[PDB]
PDB file of all heavy atoms in Angstrom:
ATOM      1  N   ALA A   1      -2.069 -25.775 -10.039  1.00  0.00           N
ATOM      2  CA  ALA A   1      -1.401 -24.769 -10.842  1.00  0.00           C
ATOM      3  C   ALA A   1      -2.283 -23.581 -11.121  1.00  0.00           C
ATOM      4  O   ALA A   1      -1.802 -22.449 -11.157  1.00  0.00           O
ATOM      5  CB  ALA A   1      -0.933 -25.386 -12.137  1.00  0.00           C
ATOM      6  N   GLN A   2      -3.565 -23.842 -11.331  1.00  0.00           N
ATOM      7  CA  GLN A   2      -4.496 -22.771 -11.636  1.00  0.00           C
ATOM      8  C   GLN A   2      -4.837 -21.947 -10.418  1.00  0.00           C
ATOM      9  O   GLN A   2      -4.950 -20.720 -10.505  1.00  0.00           O
ATOM     10  CB  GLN A   2      -5.724 -23.405 -12.243  1.00  0.00           C
ATOM     11  CG  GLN A   2      -5.507 -23.983 -13.567  1.00  0.00           C
ATOM     12  CD  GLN A   2      -5.352 -22.967 -14.531  1.00  0.00           C
ATOM     13  OE1 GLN A   2      -6.184 -22.068 -14.502  1.00  0.00           O
ATOM     14  NE2 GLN A   2      -4.356 -23.032 -15.376  1.00  0.00           N
ATOM     15  N   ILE A   3      -4.972 -22.607  -9.267  1.00  0.00           N
ATOM     16  CA  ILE A   3      -5.270 -21.879  -8.052  1.00  0.00           C
ATOM     17  C   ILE A   3      -4.073 -21.062  -7.723  1.00  0.00           C
ATOM     18  O   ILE A   3      -4.198 -19.942  -7.240  1.00  0.00           O
ATOM     19  CB  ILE A   3      -5.707 -22.766  -6.887  1.00  0.00           C
ATOM     20  CG1 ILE A   3      -7.053 -23.411  -7.204  1.00  0.00           C
ATOM     21  CG2 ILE A   3      -5.834 -21.917  -5.633  1.00  0.00           C
ATOM     22  CD1 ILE A   3      -7.474 -24.505  -6.285  1.00  0.00           C
ATOM     23  N   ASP A   4      -2.898 -21.644  -7.904  1.00  0.00           N
ATOM     24  CA  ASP A   4      -1.672 -20.961  -7.611  1.00  0.00           C
ATOM     25  C   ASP A   4      -1.520 -19.708  -8.469  1.00  0.00           C
ATOM     26  O   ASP A   4      -1.100 -18.683  -7.947  1.00  0.00           O
ATOM     27  CB  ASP A   4      -0.519 -21.928  -7.798  1.00  0.00           C
ATOM     28  CG  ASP A   4       0.770 -21.452  -7.324  1.00  0.00           C
ATOM     29  OD1 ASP A   4       0.934 -21.241  -6.143  1.00  0.00           O
ATOM     30  OD2 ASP A   4       1.640 -21.315  -8.143  1.00  0.00           O
ATOM     31  N   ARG A   5      -1.945 -19.729  -9.741  1.00  0.00           N
ATOM     32  CA  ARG A   5      -1.871 -18.479 -10.482  1.00  0.00           C
ATOM     33  C   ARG A   5      -2.718 -17.413  -9.835  1.00  0.00           C
ATOM     34  O   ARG A   5      -2.274 -16.265  -9.732  1.00  0.00           O
ATOM     35  CB  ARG A   5      -2.337 -18.625 -11.906  1.00  0.00           C
ATOM     36  CG  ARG A   5      -1.438 -19.294 -12.818  1.00  0.00           C
ATOM     37  CD  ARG A   5      -2.041 -19.307 -14.143  1.00  0.00           C
ATOM     38  NE  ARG A   5      -1.146 -19.808 -15.107  1.00  0.00           N
ATOM     39  CZ  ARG A   5      -0.223 -19.067 -15.703  1.00  0.00           C
ATOM     40  NH1 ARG A   5      -0.110 -17.769 -15.456  1.00  0.00           N
ATOM     41  NH2 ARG A   5       0.624 -19.596 -16.570  1.00  0.00           N
ATOM     42  N   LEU A   6      -3.907 -17.798  -9.354  1.00  0.00           N
ATOM     43  CA  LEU A   6      -4.736 -16.788  -8.738  1.00  0.00           C
ATOM     44  C   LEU A   6      -4.109 -16.305  -7.458  1.00  0.00           C
ATOM     45  O   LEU A   6      -4.166 -15.109  -7.175  1.00  0.00           O
ATOM     46  CB  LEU A   6      -6.152 -17.300  -8.468  1.00  0.00           C
ATOM     47  CG  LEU A   6      -7.023 -17.634  -9.653  1.00  0.00           C
ATOM     48  CD1 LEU A   6      -8.334 -18.162  -9.134  1.00  0.00           C
ATOM     49  CD2 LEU A   6      -7.221 -16.439 -10.538  1.00  0.00           C
ATOM     50  N   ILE A   7      -3.469 -17.200  -6.711  1.00  0.00           N
ATOM     51  CA  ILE A   7      -2.832 -16.771  -5.488  1.00  0.00           C
ATOM     52  C   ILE A   7      -1.733 -15.803  -5.802  1.00  0.00           C
ATOM     53  O   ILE A   7      -1.694 -14.731  -5.232  1.00  0.00           O
ATOM     54  CB  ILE A   7      -2.312 -17.951  -4.641  1.00  0.00           C
ATOM     55  CG1 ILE A   7      -3.468 -18.777  -4.090  1.00  0.00           C
ATOM     56  CG2 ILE A   7      -1.397 -17.461  -3.539  1.00  0.00           C
ATOM     57  CD1 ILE A   7      -3.058 -20.102  -3.499  1.00  0.00           C
ATOM     58  N   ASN A   8      -0.872 -16.121  -6.756  1.00  0.00           N
ATOM     59  CA  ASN A   8       0.225 -15.211  -6.994  1.00  0.00           C
ATOM     60  C   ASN A   8      -0.262 -13.839  -7.357  1.00  0.00           C
ATOM     61  O   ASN A   8       0.305 -12.844  -6.894  1.00  0.00           O
ATOM     62  CB  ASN A   8       1.115 -15.740  -8.084  1.00  0.00           C
ATOM     63  CG  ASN A   8       1.914 -16.925  -7.714  1.00  0.00           C
ATOM     64  OD1 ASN A   8       2.322 -17.652  -8.619  1.00  0.00           O
ATOM     65  ND2 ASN A   8       2.148 -17.170  -6.462  1.00  0.00           N
ATOM     66  N   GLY A   9      -1.314 -13.762  -8.166  1.00  0.00           N
ATOM     67  CA  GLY A   9      -1.843 -12.481  -8.583  1.00  0.00           C
ATOM     68  C   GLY A   9      -2.438 -11.697  -7.458  1.00  0.00           C
ATOM     69  O   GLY A   9      -2.319 -10.473  -7.428  1.00  0.00           O
ATOM     70  N   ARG A  10      -3.070 -12.387  -6.527  1.00  0.00           N
ATOM     71  CA  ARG A  10      -3.716 -11.718  -5.427  1.00  0.00           C
ATOM     72  C   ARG A  10      -2.719 -11.342  -4.365  1.00  0.00           C
ATOM     73  O   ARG A  10      -2.883 -10.312  -3.722  1.00  0.00           O
ATOM     74  CB  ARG A  10      -4.833 -12.585  -4.914  1.00  0.00           C
ATOM     75  CG  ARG A  10      -5.935 -12.698  -5.925  1.00  0.00           C
ATOM     76  CD  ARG A  10      -6.982 -13.590  -5.587  1.00  0.00           C
ATOM     77  NE  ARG A  10      -7.859 -13.670  -6.712  1.00  0.00           N
ATOM     78  CZ  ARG A  10      -8.889 -14.477  -6.871  1.00  0.00           C
ATOM     79  NH1 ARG A  10      -9.251 -15.336  -5.971  1.00  0.00           N
ATOM     80  NH2 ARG A  10      -9.523 -14.386  -8.014  1.00  0.00           N
ATOM     81  N   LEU A  11      -1.664 -12.142  -4.208  1.00  0.00           N
ATOM     82  CA  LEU A  11      -0.667 -11.801  -3.217  1.00  0.00           C
ATOM     83  C   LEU A  11       0.040 -10.562  -3.700  1.00  0.00           C
ATOM     84  O   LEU A  11       0.347  -9.655  -2.915  1.00  0.00           O
ATOM     85  CB  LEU A  11       0.388 -12.898  -3.049  1.00  0.00           C
ATOM     86  CG  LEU A  11      -0.028 -14.240  -2.519  1.00  0.00           C
ATOM     87  CD1 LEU A  11       1.177 -15.127  -2.519  1.00  0.00           C
ATOM     88  CD2 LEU A  11      -0.595 -14.157  -1.240  1.00  0.00           C
ATOM     89  N   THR A  12       0.269 -10.495  -5.017  1.00  0.00           N
ATOM     90  CA  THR A  12       0.928  -9.362  -5.635  1.00  0.00           C
ATOM     91  C   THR A  12       0.112  -8.124  -5.458  1.00  0.00           C
ATOM     92  O   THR A  12       0.655  -7.064  -5.129  1.00  0.00           O
ATOM     93  CB  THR A  12       1.212  -9.615  -7.123  1.00  0.00           C
ATOM     94  OG1 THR A  12       2.129 -10.694  -7.268  1.00  0.00           O
ATOM     95  CG2 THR A  12       1.837  -8.432  -7.769  1.00  0.00           C
ATOM     96  N   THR A  13      -1.198  -8.249  -5.672  1.00  0.00           N
ATOM     97  CA  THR A  13      -2.090  -7.130  -5.496  1.00  0.00           C
ATOM     98  C   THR A  13      -2.069  -6.624  -4.081  1.00  0.00           C
ATOM     99  O   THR A  13      -2.013  -5.410  -3.870  1.00  0.00           O
ATOM    100  CB  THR A  13      -3.518  -7.499  -5.885  1.00  0.00           C
ATOM    101  OG1 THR A  13      -3.580  -7.802  -7.259  1.00  0.00           O
ATOM    102  CG2 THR A  13      -4.472  -6.361  -5.627  1.00  0.00           C
ATOM    103  N   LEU A  14      -2.113  -7.531  -3.107  1.00  0.00           N
ATOM    104  CA  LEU A  14      -2.085  -7.075  -1.739  1.00  0.00           C
ATOM    105  C   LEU A  14      -0.768  -6.481  -1.367  1.00  0.00           C
ATOM    106  O   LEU A  14      -0.750  -5.528  -0.595  1.00  0.00           O
ATOM    107  CB  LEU A  14      -2.495  -8.174  -0.772  1.00  0.00           C
ATOM    108  CG  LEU A  14      -3.943  -8.618  -0.828  1.00  0.00           C
ATOM    109  CD1 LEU A  14      -4.122  -9.776   0.114  1.00  0.00           C
ATOM    110  CD2 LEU A  14      -4.867  -7.477  -0.467  1.00  0.00           C
ATOM    111  N   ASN A  15       0.334  -6.988  -1.908  1.00  0.00           N
ATOM    112  CA  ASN A  15       1.591  -6.366  -1.564  1.00  0.00           C
ATOM    113  C   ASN A  15       1.648  -4.976  -2.124  1.00  0.00           C
ATOM    114  O   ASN A  15       2.170  -4.072  -1.470  1.00  0.00           O
ATOM    115  CB  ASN A  15       2.750  -7.173  -2.077  1.00  0.00           C
ATOM    116  CG  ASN A  15       3.031  -8.366  -1.316  1.00  0.00           C
ATOM    117  OD1 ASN A  15       2.722  -8.465  -0.139  1.00  0.00           O
ATOM    118  ND2 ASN A  15       3.654  -9.303  -1.965  1.00  0.00           N
ATOM    119  N   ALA A  16       1.115  -4.782  -3.338  1.00  0.00           N
ATOM    120  CA  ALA A  16       1.126  -3.459  -3.938  1.00  0.00           C
ATOM    121  C   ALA A  16       0.270  -2.504  -3.154  1.00  0.00           C
ATOM    122  O   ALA A  16       0.652  -1.348  -2.960  1.00  0.00           O
ATOM    123  CB  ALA A  16       0.659  -3.544  -5.367  1.00  0.00           C
ATOM    124  N   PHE A  17      -0.874  -2.991  -2.681  1.00  0.00           N
ATOM    125  CA  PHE A  17      -1.781  -2.185  -1.889  1.00  0.00           C
ATOM    126  C   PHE A  17      -1.131  -1.733  -0.628  1.00  0.00           C
ATOM    127  O   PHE A  17      -1.185  -0.551  -0.294  1.00  0.00           O
ATOM    128  CB  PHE A  17      -3.048  -2.938  -1.574  1.00  0.00           C
ATOM    129  CG  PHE A  17      -3.979  -2.214  -0.684  1.00  0.00           C
ATOM    130  CD1 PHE A  17      -4.754  -1.190  -1.154  1.00  0.00           C
ATOM    131  CD2 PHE A  17      -4.093  -2.560   0.631  1.00  0.00           C
ATOM    132  CE1 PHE A  17      -5.615  -0.531  -0.320  1.00  0.00           C
ATOM    133  CE2 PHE A  17      -4.951  -1.900   1.455  1.00  0.00           C
ATOM    134  CZ  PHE A  17      -5.706  -0.887   0.975  1.00  0.00           C
ATOM    135  N   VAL A  18      -0.519  -2.667   0.077  1.00  0.00           N
ATOM    136  CA  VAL A  18       0.114  -2.318   1.311  1.00  0.00           C
ATOM    137  C   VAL A  18       1.249  -1.379   1.048  1.00  0.00           C
ATOM    138  O   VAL A  18       1.392  -0.391   1.751  1.00  0.00           O
ATOM    139  CB  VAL A  18       0.579  -3.558   2.060  1.00  0.00           C
ATOM    140  CG1 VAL A  18       1.398  -3.185   3.239  1.00  0.00           C
ATOM    141  CG2 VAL A  18      -0.603  -4.308   2.527  1.00  0.00           C
ATOM    142  N   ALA A  19       2.056  -1.632   0.027  1.00  0.00           N
ATOM    143  CA  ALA A  19       3.146  -0.715  -0.199  1.00  0.00           C
ATOM    144  C   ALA A  19       2.628   0.690  -0.389  1.00  0.00           C
ATOM    145  O   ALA A  19       3.232   1.624   0.137  1.00  0.00           O
ATOM    146  CB  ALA A  19       3.942  -1.154  -1.403  1.00  0.00           C
ATOM    147  N   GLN A  20       1.504   0.851  -1.083  1.00  0.00           N
ATOM    148  CA  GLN A  20       0.979   2.184  -1.256  1.00  0.00           C
ATOM    149  C   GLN A  20       0.351   2.732  -0.013  1.00  0.00           C
ATOM    150  O   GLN A  20       0.435   3.928   0.198  1.00  0.00           O
ATOM    151  CB  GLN A  20       0.027   2.235  -2.435  1.00  0.00           C
ATOM    152  CG  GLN A  20       0.710   1.964  -3.740  1.00  0.00           C
ATOM    153  CD  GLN A  20       1.718   3.063  -4.056  1.00  0.00           C
ATOM    154  OE1 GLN A  20       2.920   2.880  -3.839  1.00  0.00           O
ATOM    155  NE2 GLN A  20       1.243   4.184  -4.590  1.00  0.00           N
ATOM    156  N   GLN A  21      -0.255   1.905   0.830  1.00  0.00           N
ATOM    157  CA  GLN A  21      -0.819   2.501   2.024  1.00  0.00           C
ATOM    158  C   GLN A  21       0.301   3.002   2.882  1.00  0.00           C
ATOM    159  O   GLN A  21       0.138   4.033   3.521  1.00  0.00           O
ATOM    160  CB  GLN A  21      -1.730   1.545   2.756  1.00  0.00           C
ATOM    161  CG  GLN A  21      -2.997   1.215   2.004  1.00  0.00           C
ATOM    162  CD  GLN A  21      -3.853   2.394   1.781  1.00  0.00           C
ATOM    163  OE1 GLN A  21      -3.823   3.011   0.705  1.00  0.00           O
ATOM    164  NE2 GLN A  21      -4.653   2.730   2.788  1.00  0.00           N
ATOM    165  N   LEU A  22       1.442   2.313   2.884  1.00  0.00           N
ATOM    166  CA  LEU A  22       2.581   2.801   3.647  1.00  0.00           C
ATOM    167  C   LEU A  22       3.143   4.084   3.023  1.00  0.00           C
ATOM    168  O   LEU A  22       3.486   5.008   3.757  1.00  0.00           O
ATOM    169  CB  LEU A  22       3.603   1.681   3.903  1.00  0.00           C
ATOM    170  CG  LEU A  22       3.270   0.507   5.053  1.00  0.00           C
ATOM    171  CD1 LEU A  22       1.875   0.011   4.963  1.00  0.00           C
ATOM    172  CD2 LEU A  22       4.025  -0.710   5.260  1.00  0.00           C
ATOM    173  N   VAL A  23       3.194   4.176   1.692  1.00  0.00           N
ATOM    174  CA  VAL A  23       3.690   5.401   1.090  1.00  0.00           C
ATOM    175  C   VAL A  23       2.763   6.560   1.355  1.00  0.00           C
ATOM    176  O   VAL A  23       3.218   7.676   1.624  1.00  0.00           O
ATOM    177  CB  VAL A  23       3.925   5.221  -0.415  1.00  0.00           C
ATOM    178  CG1 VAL A  23       4.245   6.536  -1.070  1.00  0.00           C
ATOM    179  CG2 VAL A  23       5.087   4.286  -0.628  1.00  0.00           C
ATOM    180  N   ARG A  24       1.469   6.322   1.218  1.00  0.00           N
ATOM    181  CA  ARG A  24       0.477   7.349   1.407  1.00  0.00           C
ATOM    182  C   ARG A  24       0.355   7.773   2.848  1.00  0.00           C
ATOM    183  O   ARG A  24       0.140   8.953   3.112  1.00  0.00           O
ATOM    184  CB  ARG A  24      -0.854   6.864   0.861  1.00  0.00           C
ATOM    185  CG  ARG A  24      -0.883   6.716  -0.651  1.00  0.00           C
ATOM    186  CD  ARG A  24      -2.173   6.201  -1.198  1.00  0.00           C
ATOM    187  NE  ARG A  24      -3.267   7.118  -0.980  1.00  0.00           N
ATOM    188  CZ  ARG A  24      -4.340   6.909  -0.223  1.00  0.00           C
ATOM    189  NH1 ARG A  24      -4.570   5.778   0.392  1.00  0.00           N
ATOM    190  NH2 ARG A  24      -5.196   7.866  -0.092  1.00  0.00           N
ATOM    191  N   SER A  25       0.521   6.845   3.791  1.00  0.00           N
ATOM    192  CA  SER A  25       0.440   7.218   5.186  1.00  0.00           C
ATOM    193  C   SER A  25       1.688   7.949   5.625  1.00  0.00           C
ATOM    194  O   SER A  25       1.638   8.804   6.511  1.00  0.00           O
ATOM    195  CB  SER A  25       0.215   5.969   6.025  1.00  0.00           C
ATOM    196  OG  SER A  25       1.317   5.125   5.962  1.00  0.00           O
ATOM    197  N   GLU A  26       2.825   7.676   4.973  1.00  0.00           N
ATOM    198  CA  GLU A  26       4.042   8.382   5.337  1.00  0.00           C
ATOM    199  C   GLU A  26       3.910   9.800   4.849  1.00  0.00           C
ATOM    200  O   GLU A  26       4.242  10.755   5.558  1.00  0.00           O
ATOM    201  CB  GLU A  26       5.263   7.694   4.716  1.00  0.00           C
ATOM    202  CG  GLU A  26       6.629   8.266   5.102  1.00  0.00           C
ATOM    203  CD  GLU A  26       6.984   8.051   6.528  1.00  0.00           C
ATOM    204  OE1 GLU A  26       6.439   7.151   7.118  1.00  0.00           O
ATOM    205  OE2 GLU A  26       7.792   8.777   7.042  1.00  0.00           O
ATOM    206  N   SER A  27       3.382   9.953   3.631  1.00  0.00           N
ATOM    207  CA  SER A  27       3.204  11.268   3.054  1.00  0.00           C
ATOM    208  C   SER A  27       2.228  12.083   3.838  1.00  0.00           C
ATOM    209  O   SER A  27       2.467  13.266   4.087  1.00  0.00           O
ATOM    210  CB  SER A  27       2.757  11.149   1.617  1.00  0.00           C
ATOM    211  OG  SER A  27       2.524  12.400   1.070  1.00  0.00           O
ATOM    212  N   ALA A  28       1.100  11.480   4.210  1.00  0.00           N
ATOM    213  CA  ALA A  28       0.109  12.196   4.983  1.00  0.00           C
ATOM    214  C   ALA A  28       0.667  12.608   6.322  1.00  0.00           C
ATOM    215  O   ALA A  28       0.352  13.683   6.809  1.00  0.00           O
ATOM    216  CB  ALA A  28      -1.131  11.368   5.151  1.00  0.00           C
ATOM    217  N   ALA A  29       1.491  11.766   6.942  1.00  0.00           N
ATOM    218  CA  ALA A  29       2.067  12.141   8.220  1.00  0.00           C
ATOM    219  C   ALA A  29       3.002  13.339   8.097  1.00  0.00           C
ATOM    220  O   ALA A  29       3.015  14.200   8.979  1.00  0.00           O
ATOM    221  CB  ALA A  29       2.784  10.958   8.805  1.00  0.00           C
ATOM    222  N   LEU A  30       3.779  13.407   7.005  1.00  0.00           N
ATOM    223  CA  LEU A  30       4.658  14.559   6.849  1.00  0.00           C
ATOM    224  C   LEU A  30       3.842  15.783   6.647  1.00  0.00           C
ATOM    225  O   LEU A  30       4.148  16.863   7.171  1.00  0.00           O
ATOM    226  CB  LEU A  30       5.573  14.401   5.632  1.00  0.00           C
ATOM    227  CG  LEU A  30       6.653  13.395   5.684  1.00  0.00           C
ATOM    228  CD1 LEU A  30       7.238  13.270   4.298  1.00  0.00           C
ATOM    229  CD2 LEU A  30       7.723  13.840   6.642  1.00  0.00           C
ATOM    230  N   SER A  31       2.780  15.620   5.885  1.00  0.00           N
ATOM    231  CA  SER A  31       1.886  16.694   5.560  1.00  0.00           C
ATOM    232  C   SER A  31       1.213  17.173   6.823  1.00  0.00           C
ATOM    233  O   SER A  31       1.113  18.373   7.045  1.00  0.00           O
ATOM    234  CB  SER A  31       0.940  16.222   4.468  1.00  0.00           C
ATOM    235  OG  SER A  31       0.133  17.241   4.015  1.00  0.00           O
ATOM    236  N   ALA A  32       0.825  16.257   7.700  1.00  0.00           N
ATOM    237  CA  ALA A  32       0.228  16.635   8.964  1.00  0.00           C
ATOM    238  C   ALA A  32       1.152  17.500   9.787  1.00  0.00           C
ATOM    239  O   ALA A  32       0.683  18.395  10.482  1.00  0.00           O
ATOM    240  CB  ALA A  32      -0.181  15.427   9.747  1.00  0.00           C
ATOM    241  N   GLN A  33       2.456  17.245   9.721  1.00  0.00           N
ATOM    242  CA  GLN A  33       3.363  18.096  10.473  1.00  0.00           C
ATOM    243  C   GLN A  33       3.445  19.468   9.819  1.00  0.00           C
ATOM    244  O   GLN A  33       3.655  20.458  10.509  1.00  0.00           O
ATOM    245  CB  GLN A  33       4.718  17.443  10.636  1.00  0.00           C
ATOM    246  CG  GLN A  33       4.685  16.214  11.541  1.00  0.00           C
ATOM    247  CD  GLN A  33       4.295  16.551  12.988  1.00  0.00           C
ATOM    248  OE1 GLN A  33       4.886  17.430  13.612  1.00  0.00           O
ATOM    249  NE2 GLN A  33       3.292  15.855  13.524  1.00  0.00           N
ATOM    250  N   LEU A  34       3.243  19.537   8.501  1.00  0.00           N
ATOM    251  CA  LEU A  34       3.226  20.834   7.856  1.00  0.00           C
ATOM    252  C   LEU A  34       2.005  21.591   8.324  1.00  0.00           C
ATOM    253  O   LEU A  34       2.070  22.798   8.555  1.00  0.00           O
ATOM    254  CB  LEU A  34       3.209  20.717   6.338  1.00  0.00           C
ATOM    255  CG  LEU A  34       3.208  22.017   5.552  1.00  0.00           C
ATOM    256  CD1 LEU A  34       4.435  22.848   5.854  1.00  0.00           C
ATOM    257  CD2 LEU A  34       3.125  21.675   4.111  1.00  0.00           C
ATOM    258  N   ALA A  35       0.879  20.884   8.435  1.00  0.00           N
ATOM    259  CA  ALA A  35      -0.351  21.509   8.899  1.00  0.00           C
ATOM    260  C   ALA A  35      -0.174  22.033  10.297  1.00  0.00           C
ATOM    261  O   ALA A  35      -0.672  23.109  10.620  1.00  0.00           O
ATOM    262  CB  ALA A  35      -1.474  20.517   8.873  1.00  0.00           C
ATOM    263  N   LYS A  36       0.548  21.273  11.128  1.00  0.00           N
ATOM    264  CA  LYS A  36       0.837  21.674  12.493  1.00  0.00           C
ATOM    265  C   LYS A  36       1.602  22.970  12.506  1.00  0.00           C
ATOM    266  O   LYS A  36       1.270  23.889  13.267  1.00  0.00           O
ATOM    267  CB  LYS A  36       1.649  20.600  13.188  1.00  0.00           C
ATOM    268  CG  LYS A  36       2.025  20.893  14.586  1.00  0.00           C
ATOM    269  CD  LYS A  36       2.940  19.799  15.090  1.00  0.00           C
ATOM    270  CE  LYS A  36       3.540  20.127  16.436  1.00  0.00           C
ATOM    271  NZ  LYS A  36       4.544  19.126  16.842  1.00  0.00           N
ATOM    272  N   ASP A  37       2.618  23.063  11.637  1.00  0.00           N
ATOM    273  CA  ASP A  37       3.409  24.273  11.586  1.00  0.00           C
ATOM    274  C   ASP A  37       2.611  25.436  11.100  1.00  0.00           C
ATOM    275  O   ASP A  37       2.767  26.523  11.634  1.00  0.00           O
ATOM    276  CB  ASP A  37       4.652  24.093  10.719  1.00  0.00           C
ATOM    277  CG  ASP A  37       5.771  23.266  11.347  1.00  0.00           C
ATOM    278  OD1 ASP A  37       5.760  23.042  12.533  1.00  0.00           O
ATOM    279  OD2 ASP A  37       6.678  22.924  10.626  1.00  0.00           O
ATOM    280  N   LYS A  38       1.731  25.224  10.132  1.00  0.00           N
ATOM    281  CA  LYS A  38       0.924  26.331   9.687  1.00  0.00           C
ATOM    282  C   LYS A  38      -0.060  26.785  10.712  1.00  0.00           C
ATOM    283  O   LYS A  38      -0.276  27.980  10.838  1.00  0.00           O
ATOM    284  CB  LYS A  38       0.319  26.055   8.337  1.00  0.00           C
ATOM    285  CG  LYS A  38       1.371  26.136   7.303  1.00  0.00           C
ATOM    286  CD  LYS A  38       0.942  25.958   5.967  1.00  0.00           C
ATOM    287  CE  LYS A  38       2.138  26.285   5.063  1.00  0.00           C
ATOM    288  NZ  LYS A  38       1.818  26.251   3.668  1.00  0.00           N
TER     289      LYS A  38
END
């Protein structure tokens, strides 16, 4: 039960991290196309 609490917390952290890397990489890619246009 105790290990499982740590797992849930860490899995949550990694999911949050990945979700943000996907948001940030999508944003940067759009931005890169703006840079291309400029």
Side-chain angles (χ1 to χ4, degrees):
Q2 291 288 312
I3 294 168
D4 190 64
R5 285 182 173 276
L6 294 178
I7 292 168
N8 289 157
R10 292 175 186 173
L11 295 177
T12 296
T13 296
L14 292 175
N15 284 335
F17 176 77
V18 172
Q20 295 295 100
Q21 292 297 97
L22 285 44
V23 172
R24 292 178 65 245
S25 66
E26 185 68 22
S27 177
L30 290 170
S31 186
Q33 292 296 308
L34 181 60
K36 179 186 171 186
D37 285 345
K38 287 183 172 185

